[PDB]
Design a protein around this ligand. Structure first.
Ligand SMILES: [Cl-]
Ligand SMILES: [Cl-]
Ligand SMILES: [Cl-]
Ligand SMILES: [Cl-]
Ligand SMILES: [Cl-]
Ligand SMILES: [Cl-]
Ligand SMILES: [Cl-]
Lengths: 269, 273, 270, 279
């Protein structure tokens, strides 16, 4: 999986072709203020290390807020940020500044995808791809925190199980902790280059459907390669771009009916 | 990777079956105890149900999603319609007796098969099961029998190469009778697609995400799909009767999840409000 | 307006009971078939359950809302949602499902009575016989409510349970001689519900009001803490909320399922 | 009898308005600041919306329940039909709105939130100091940019032929939310339950706006402001062949707002759902 220079004359073309083949695209030298991202990591790490985080227990109805690890206990805790949702006062400015900058970049990347789609694929998009996410109510910024392992606790081979994203596209800065991998056509796992300043973008199931399979939603995971430090906290900031529910993806589905169908496949009551 | 048809009746069928599941996520049994004629009668009478406008009297309950789901509600239309049958749920009077008799028989077999899976797990895997596998599904509220119907393609409707897209099941195990319509395929470790033998009298079992979790990845939940191979008659209806065995939500799967907290996290992962 | 205790065994009890429902939304029966000693045993063992650490292993399932709900900002009651299909502690299962069946059997009889004494013109509005609406109903709920004792410097308010109407078909509740339950009268006053040991209280809910075109009213009710209610005692109650199948046709305008959906839309639930 | 119409312009209006709410759960304002012709423009174009089959393109989203809700017809086992007497549209700033209607309806939403915010200031100002102290944050802050606040556009279609109009159009109910705000249009029938069990008529002239306390403000104010039962009857003379449009705006607090020692808005709703037996 090759890292592409956002500044390069041919970057758009190579980026979308990366998406078409692998389902993923990696960009270095991107326009999102890198010092803003590190500021964000620091202050959210403080937040997760604080007792005050429990004041923001997620709302039962809408699932915006803080989700603690916990009987049974998961190995991550997280926070769901929505522009419309509950956000702590002292973290609001930065996180929404990032949210907006990430959306704007996503919107540009969606233009690129549409530009370099063949005419027979372009013709299947009910509206232009960037419009599908403009002021999307469902777009979610997930602040993920994996805490240090304490004492006896043993770290697994796999940190995040293999999976496909359901949404349109997902945007994630890396933090130079290798482990993210994507499924290749031949059953092997390709390592996503995760140097500082890279941003990783991937196709989710709804753009796969909108494109009639042309852009594939690829299974991906995060492993713990040999010599990963069990005592370090890992924070990550994935942004899941969702289309408006009423967007017609194909002759078979709208975004809303595609989601409901998934809910029935999973047997959710 | 090959997918072998195991004769249920054979003295060593349990060990081979559980080993097939361990390697591929799937197990195929012939000469199984479920009455083949019951199943045929079920296809005939539900085919008739889907071919009547009276099916619309059974529009699914909005609260609990039991009942009839049509292909359609400018406008958009899926290539299938289906019915969600639960013992507790709405079922048409004329179809109740047979479909629930099938539900019981398929549950009783699934229950035996889970005994097999436990028996032939190594001690260090057995030891991760919070309760015996069969107890996870006994009288399960969530176990879903889906009656799936792909209607005839009409006029100049075109048939895609893929009927049901690559997916994994989330639940514990899923049990499906075949009916000599090739197409169901399972993902091999080398990125290729294996055909599942689909002769009359075969029943197909597969590992779901919750049993992968419970076994610490020892039994894999494998990607599968249904293609429309060359010669598939676009004008023929297809009915199928998949049974999705769900553990009780309070089942501890592992140090990390109950069945309930596993499903909840899936929903947060998908961005469901 | 007054609320009369009607002896279930009386020759004319059905007629009087139904007229009580029509006039007030409520009927009170004494000498009913449910064994007092079962109910006593249920109170006793569920009290112990709530007054234990064991309860926290039965935290309600997030998806289907069956199981235990702690007070856990802090409410003044905790409770358990019991369904025949749902989670139930092993040690409590047999008695509580025994009670569930007996209370359902009695509810079924009481629904026959209600239908029998409805005028023809009201009978005609019932899409199916009233008892069939609840036979093997997935949604019927047995709620076990526990108000714990006041601890230390906590004050006990005048109203234990705020004025409300039930949404369902009918609701069935044994009393254990703790006065406080009240029903709103037509003149705006509150009528005390006689709550002697051995009484069972039945009331019309909104869906049976709809199904009967207003003929049987779903009446506002509340529970107060009268003067000298002992703040240091627990209270347990066993309300059974009988819910029609979602697909039951209540009227020209609603099924049970669409009635509920309309209520969620009115409440602004996303 | 009737509730008092209070002229917004009068100097003592605020004081008398808050007292009407305390006494009856409701307040009626005339000559309010919301442009009369905006409200008329909205009635007109939404009536138009419901009078077309193009509305069906905006079928509500199943996940989030924003959009258009038809009165679907279904047929039963005995050849009866089930069909509500109203269809409606749920408008949220974040939700789906038809392009041709967005500007006016969001301008109205903004303007009505502004009035409701002033009215909540009024409610706080004239609360006694002991009641003021029960509000965890200022009342207006509870609804500022609230995600849950809902503008529900209701349409009762004409009946023709032998179709019967019932004596009751909307059943007696309470609002769960903080406050609700409703312009009227000279269609009598909205009533409020008085303390002695009788029904009070609400003066419903054009240019009136009706405001009522909801359960969450009753809870926040420890019963000082009552959430009162109201209904809509079809009084003698109501013409069944006429459409009726109405625009109630339900102001909901942020979920995380603490209402009392016992509930947040979120835990209060969850409790209602559990009491209702919603799975
Ligand atoms: Cl939308
Ligand atoms: Cl359970
Ligand atoms: Cl999924
Ligand atoms: Cl039903
Ligand atoms: Cl005046
Ligand atoms: Cl909030
Ligand atoms: Cl309610």
């Amino acid at each position: 999986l090759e890292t592409i220079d956002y500044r390069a004359a041919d970057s758009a073309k190579r980026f979308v072709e990366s998406l078409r083949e692998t389902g993923f695209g990696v960009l270095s030298n991107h326009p999102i203020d890198k010092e803003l991202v590190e500021r964000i990591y620091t202050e959210w790490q403080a937040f997760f290390n604080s007792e005050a985080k429990n004041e923001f227990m997620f709302n039962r109805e809408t699932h915006d807020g803080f989700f603690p690890a916990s009987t049974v206990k998961d190995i991550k805790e997280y926070y769901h940020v929505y522009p419309w949702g509950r956000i702590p006062d002292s973290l609001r400015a930065n996180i929404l500044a990032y949210y907006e900058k990430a959306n704007t970049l996503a919107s540009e990347l969606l233009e690129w995808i549409e530009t370099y789609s063949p005419d027979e694929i372009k013709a299947k998009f009910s509206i232009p791809l960037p419009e599908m996410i403009a002021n999307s109510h469902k777009t979610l910024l997930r602040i993920l925190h994996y805490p240090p392992m304490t004492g006896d606790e043993e770290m697994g081979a796999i940190r995040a199980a293999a999976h496909e994203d359901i949404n349109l596209i997902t945007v994630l800065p890396t933090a130079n902790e290798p482990g993210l991998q994507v499924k290749a056509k031949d059953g092997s796992w390709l390592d996503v280059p995760s140097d500082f300043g890279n941003i990783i973008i991937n196709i989710g199931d709804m753009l796969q459907e909108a494109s009639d399979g042309y852009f594939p939603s690829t299974s991906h995971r995060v492993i713990n390669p040999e010599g990963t430090d069990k005592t370090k906290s890992r924070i990550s900031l994935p942004l899941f771009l969702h289309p408006h529910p009423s967007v017609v993806l194909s002759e078979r589905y709208t975004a809303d009916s595609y989601l409901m169908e998934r809910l029935r496949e999973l047997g959710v009551l």
